[PDB]
């Protein structure tokens, strides 16, 4: 809904690092739901066929995740979970352009970027902005930001938390403990014969 | 003057060679910290 | 450490999934239509153009059966700046005139009007409800006096997508959305078993 | 006697940010 | 005429005189904090200047007594938030500039007491210009050079053994500096901010001499007791015995080359180009 | 298994040659010796960088062992012998060419566990911990193998 | 007599001439890409040579007009995939070699316009040999040196204020280079591949002069308006007013020592050893 | 007058690989 207008002309970038990120991507998800008593397969035929035709496989190139979401009951919610699992791991352009201004800009804003050495001349969505003083760098992440070891640890941590809470009755009787804290200072001072002590405990 | 001629324009590039700071990069990005601390020419001794 | 954690949590996620459960399948498929824009004012081509997000939304919503956009006006303005996907209106309107439809080919719509304005920097197409479809601009202001302005929309398959296609009839149905010309909107889905590769024909 | 008178500071943030693409790589190579 | 370096009630005049046509005063100006872009699609780079600049003064001169030389060494080495003010006797500079000893440098001051000269000391100062309203800190440490009225030989004492340095060819170079202070960029002052730290300084004595007699006994007494033994937490006691008016200092040799014995073709004696001691903790 | 290739690029023209899943092969030769195809795989990351004026394209590719890593055992092998479980698992649960001449189990036990739902490489490494500590993988052409070590 | 350096239709002849017995041409050969093993159980290392070698040329010469010197600067600085061909007038070299400016250097070309020497320019060029079929790129960027016919003083303008540099002792050194190009190893042939980049170049003007009159006013006007103010993303306008036939450019001082004021014992004036400006974003 | 005339690029992979021995160590000291 917003465009930054100023852009990044070919004279206004001065570093870039632009990948397509595809090491996480998979092409089949199977989601167990309904207390684990029904399943749905979400099936990306294009990547399965392109890996087959590319590598010369005997049959379509399946790469799978299995999920269980035992409290999900409607099959269309188990499908939408499988589609979200594929979509958020799918192959996309990403990475950074380094420029100088853009204090008005935010993630979700649109910007024209041109980088003639790299064949880029497009409107991108800004996924993130870093401003560094000192070096005077504004670093735009474009299209989509994606993590490193923190995406691994976040997917594990999210999964462990989902399983940790799996049996909990959410309408259970509920109780409260208030944590509160106060302290008394006691100040010693010692006077001997009109001479104050130099240190105390 | 004979010794000074060779000397002065040796003492000059001695500073040029000695005073160059480090500028390390990983994968195109600078990793030297932009600590805003000054340094200036040492005493001539 | 990460792979032993990952294997351990995966083993617990699937604990109690019935592996003889009823399976079901969702197939994921992609097709795309390019609507290429070209704009001619008095024999001068526009130097930049956009099919804006409100036009993309209009064709999207029409494809859901929510009714077609009636293209009503060519609009002209004073301002080359801010040209982007997110433009909802011209930078500064100066005039507008009623369009005439022309359908010169199975995949093309042309909208034409005759117009008089000095200093035109921008052109657009407007739906009767005020929704902009197109903005296009010139590097140097154009003087129009009883001159024709033509906006031409051309529909194509996106040949970037793999093993999916918009057929010639699908691309014609998108023309017929842009024209409000009784489009063959989607009403059915088919599955088959001939694996012969996709083509527009 | 006239002749005789003629005689690195390294940014921990930028290292750890730059190496992220490489630190995660073996785990991606092993799936998850 | 003459250049004054001062801090509150303490003041030193440094003559700024030299032989012939030597450089007395070099002042340098710079922008260490401009960001000239290393790359980008234009023929010439985009730039941004957005911080205080550098100004340096290098002063070369001579002092006419040792007492003033020790006052200068102490004045430079001292940690104090009281501004160090330099007065330059040349019309291209304002009447006072506030300064720090050279911003990151182990040798802000050098004093040379060459052989064959009396009541002459060669002075070299490097000073960084700093904003007069922006001298900051909490600690306060007055430096003091030990002094005495004797005239004995310079003595190096370690392991209960004392070695007298030969008078023959004896030359002394002393360097002083405050490398642990921080001089820092400021957004839109002209000059930088100065952070005075009550922290470790640099103070080094270098000797050169030629051993002419009892040569093995002299050199071996030094190298056995100082170089080949481990000195622990302590070090050499270096005592000037009142030469140059100097007293006794605790010190240690440092690094790969603090002492060297040189033998030349056709010479029946040994040259010491350097014997170099850094002053160590004894200000208890 | 993986490979990394570093190239120069101009105007991003080489970066367009490497869409995710495209085949890459690395051949090697020393001296006048003939080319050996030492790596075959598919692109998983393409990255292009400003490196001190150079436009460096770095392409990273994984190989066939990912199709054992990223698939799960679908049938139940209780009461199959290990040579039958290898034929069952590889011929349905992974897109790899099966050939019974390449599988030679050193101690052909019968599986008591159901392996159903385990990752294929993880199940094969269990069959190899039973049997005789055996080597397995995807070999020459695209055939699976499972055979005695050394 | 002359070496010829050319790119398509543009050509410059450089007289390979110098005083007495100075070096006119140095050609260096090397193998940067041999792997010599740092260890292993042999007395002598195993090695592998498997890549293109390095050949470099240093040319020293003189030019007899300023116009040709500007053509040479523009020829060297320009980005084009059109091969830069060098012809060497000596039998140890082939009739033509394809070249890049020195592979990673800020100063590939230096032009010196020293005091006294009317209609003489010292040229020092450094060139890397590259494979003639392996000049690669996309962008062309024709470099230009602005020119005018005046005879005015060299002027430095910043903050609406103009300083005229003294004529007395005035010398100009201009240096040019293409550090953002890549010269890269290839496995099968003698010479490397050359990647031409439409990216930031190096272009530097160094002045040297002696300031004889109105000395505080002249030096303070320079130091206040250039060195003590923050210049933003603009900079100095540096204008030659037609000296050497040069016009006007935007530029900035860079780094720790781009300007020095030097005072010598017994002299009633200030020397400026260097005043350095790097050319900045300007073209459209 | 004749006398007067006489006047690092660091590989992100190899840092990420070489440090692996040490990055994993605190967790090993704590079991898993
Ligand atoms: Mg008390
Ligand atoms: Mg168009």
TrEMBL record, chain A:
It comes from the Viruses. This is Baseplate hub. The chain holds residues 202 to 402 of 954 of the full protein. Mg(2+) 7 binds at residues 188-189, 200. It comes from Haloferax tailed virus 1.
TrEMBL record, chain B:
This is Phate tail tape measure protein. Residues 36-45 have a biased composition (Basic and acidic residues). Residues 1-8 have a biased composition (Gly residues). Residues 1-45 are annotated as: Disordered. It comes from the Viruses.
TrEMBL record, chains E, G:
It comes from the Viruses. This is Uncharacterized protein.
């Amino acid at each position: 809904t917003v465009h930054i207008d100023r852009g990044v002309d070919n004279t206004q970038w001065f570093r870039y690092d632009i990948p397509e990120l595809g090491k996480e991507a998979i092409n089949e998800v199977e989601v167990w739901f309904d207390d684990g008593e029904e399943s749905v397969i979400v099936d990306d035929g294009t990547d399965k066929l392109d890996l087959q035709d590319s590598l010369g496989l005997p049959s379509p190139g399946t790469q799978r995740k299995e999920l269980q979401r035992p409290l999900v009951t409607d099959i269309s919610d188990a499908e939408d979970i499988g589609r979200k699992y594929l979509a958020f791991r799918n192959s996309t352009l990403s990475g950074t352009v380094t420029t100088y201004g853009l204090y008005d800009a935010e993630p979700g804003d649109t910007i024209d970027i041109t980088i003639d050495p790299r064949g880029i001349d497009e409107e991108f969505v800004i996924a993130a902005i870093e401003y560094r003083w000192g070096v005077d760098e504004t670093i735009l992440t474009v299209v989509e930001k994606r993590g490193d070891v923190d995406d691994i640890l976040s997917e594990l941590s999210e999964s462990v938390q989902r399983i940790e809470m799996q049996g909990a009755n959410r309408d259970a009787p509920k109780n409260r403990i208030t944590t509160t804290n106060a302290a008394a200072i006691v100040s010693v001072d010692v006077d001997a014969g009109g001479t104050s002590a130099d240190a105390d405990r | 003057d004979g010794g000074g001629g060779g000397g002065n324009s040796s003492r000059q590039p001695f500073a040029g060679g000695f005073f160059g700071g480090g500028n390390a990069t990983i994968d195109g990005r600078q990793i030297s910290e932009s600590t805003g601390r000054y340094r200036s020419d040492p005493s001539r001794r | 450490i990460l792979s032993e954690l990952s294997e351990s949590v995966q083993r617990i996620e699937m604990q109690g999934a019935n592996r003889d459960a009823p399976k079901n399948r969702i197939t994921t498929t992609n097709a795309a239509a390019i609507v290429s824009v070209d704009v001619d004012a008095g024999g001068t081509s526009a130097d930049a153009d956009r099919f804006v997000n409100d036009g993309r939304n209009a064709v999207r919503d029409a494809w859901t059966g929510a009714g077609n956009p009636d293209i009503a006006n060519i609009v002209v303005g004073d301002d080359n700046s801010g040209l982007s996907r997110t433009n909802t209106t011209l930078g500064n309107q100066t005039d507008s005139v009623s369009v005439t439809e022309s359908l010169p080919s199975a995949k093309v719509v042309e909208y034409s009007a005759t117009l008089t304005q000095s200093g035109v920097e921008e052109i657009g197409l407007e739906t009767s409800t005020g929704t902009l479809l197109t903005r296009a601009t010139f590097e140097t202001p154009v003087d129009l006096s009883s001159d024709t302005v033509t906006v031409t929309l051309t529909v194509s398959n996106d040949d970037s997508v793999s093993r999916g296609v918009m057929t010639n009839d699908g691309q014609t149905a998108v023309r017929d959305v842009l024209a409000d010309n009784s489009p063959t909107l989607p009403t059915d889905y088919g599955y088959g078993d001939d694996s012969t590769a996709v083509a527009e024909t | 006697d006239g002749g005789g008178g003629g005689g690195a500071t390294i940014d921990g943030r930028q290292i750890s940010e730059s190496t992220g693409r490489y630190r995660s790589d073996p785990s991606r190579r092993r799936g998850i | 005429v003459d250049a004054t370096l001062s801090r509150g009630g303490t003041s030193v005049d440094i003559p700024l005189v030299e032989e012939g046509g030597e450089i007395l005063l070099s002042s340098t100006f710079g922008k260490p904090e401009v960001n000239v872009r290393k790359s980008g699609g234009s023929l010439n780079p985009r730039v941004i200047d957005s911080w205080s600049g550098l100004q340096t003064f290098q002063l070369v001169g001579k002092l006419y007594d040792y007492s003033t030389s020790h006052q200068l060494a102490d004045l430079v080495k001292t940690a104090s938030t009281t501004p160090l003010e330099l007065q330059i006797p040349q019309d291209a500079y304002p009447d006072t500039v506030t300064v720090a000893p050279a911003a990151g440098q182990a040798s802000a001051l050098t004093l040379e007491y060459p052989a064959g000269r009396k009541d002459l000391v060669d002075v070299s100062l490097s000073l960084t210009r700093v904003d007069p309203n922006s001298v900051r800190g909490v600690g306060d440490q007055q430096a003091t050079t030990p002094t005495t009225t004797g005239t004995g030989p310079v003595e190096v004492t370690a392991g209960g053994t004392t070695v007298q340095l030969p008078s023959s060819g004896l030359s002394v170079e002393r360097t002083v500096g405050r490398p642990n202070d921080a001089v820092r960029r400021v957004p839109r002052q002209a000059d930088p901010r100065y952070e005075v730290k009550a922290k470790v300084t640099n103070d080094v004595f270098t000797f050169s001499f030629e051993t002419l007699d009892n040569i093995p006994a002299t050199l071996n007494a030094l190298t056995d007791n100082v170089f080949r033994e481990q000195l622990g937490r302590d070090g050499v006691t270096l005592d000037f015995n009142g030469l140059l008016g100097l007293g006794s200092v605790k010190a240690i040799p440092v690094g790969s080359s603090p002492f060297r014995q040189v033998h030349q073709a056709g010479r029946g004696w040994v040259t010491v180009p350097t014997l170099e001691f850094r002053r160590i903790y004894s200000n208890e | 298994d993986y490979a990394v290739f570093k190239m120069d690029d101009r105007g991003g023209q080489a970066f367009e040659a490497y869409p995710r899943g495209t085949r890459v092969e690395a051949y090697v030769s020393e001296g006048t010796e003939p080319l050996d195809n030492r790596f075959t795989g598919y692109v998983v990351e393409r990255r292009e960088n400003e490196q001190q004026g150079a436009d460096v394209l770095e392409v990273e590719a994984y190989s066939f062992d990912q199709f054992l890593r990223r698939n799960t055992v679908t049938n139940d092998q209780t009461g199959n012998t290990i040579s039958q479980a290898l034929a069952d698992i590889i011929q349905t649960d992974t897109p790899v060419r099966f050939n019974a001449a390449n599988i030679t189990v050193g101690d052909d036990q019968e599986l008591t566990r159901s392996y159903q739902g385990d990752p294929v490489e993880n199940a094969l490494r269990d069959f190899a911990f039973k049997s005789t500590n055996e080597d397995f993988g995807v070999g020459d052409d695209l055939e699976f193998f499972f055979q005695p070590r050394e």
